[PDB]
Design a protein around this ligand. Sequence first.
Ligand code: NAG
Ligand code: NAG
Lengths: 53, 48
Amino acid sequence: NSDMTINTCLIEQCHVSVTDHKKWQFNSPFVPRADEPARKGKVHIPFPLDNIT
Amino acid sequence: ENTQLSEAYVDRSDVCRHDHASAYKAHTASLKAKVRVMYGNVNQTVDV
Ligand SMILES: *[C@@H]1O[C@H](CO)[C@@H](O)[C@H](O)[C@H]1NC(C)=O
Ligand SMILES: *[C@@H]1O[C@H](CO)[C@@H](O)[C@H](O)[C@H]1NC(C)=O
């Protein structure tokens, strides 16, 4: 949460990425993982199967 | 210099207990009838 300054460099020579871990998200196969061991969690999903006529 | 680790496997369906096919082996069968007997004043049907 701080603005940072470096002096004699160009924007091309810097790689910057946001970090936030206040919330989980789904284990999608189109987004990459964080850690190799891959600790995870679970969330029950609605609408179960049931019998009708 | 960057490597991706791809991984996948197979699991049984979520509703496999609600719809599936059972493979069996069938042996000697047992007859079991339901007969009605009538004589005189009796009127009954028995499971035998
Ligand atoms: C529907 O009822 C049958 C019992 O005849 C049960 O075995 C089956 O699991 C039921 N299906 C669902 C989706 O609850
Ligand atoms: C009693 O026997 C008669 C034939 O005499 C039959 O028509 C009737 O169905 C029998 N009674 C019952 C309750 O089934």
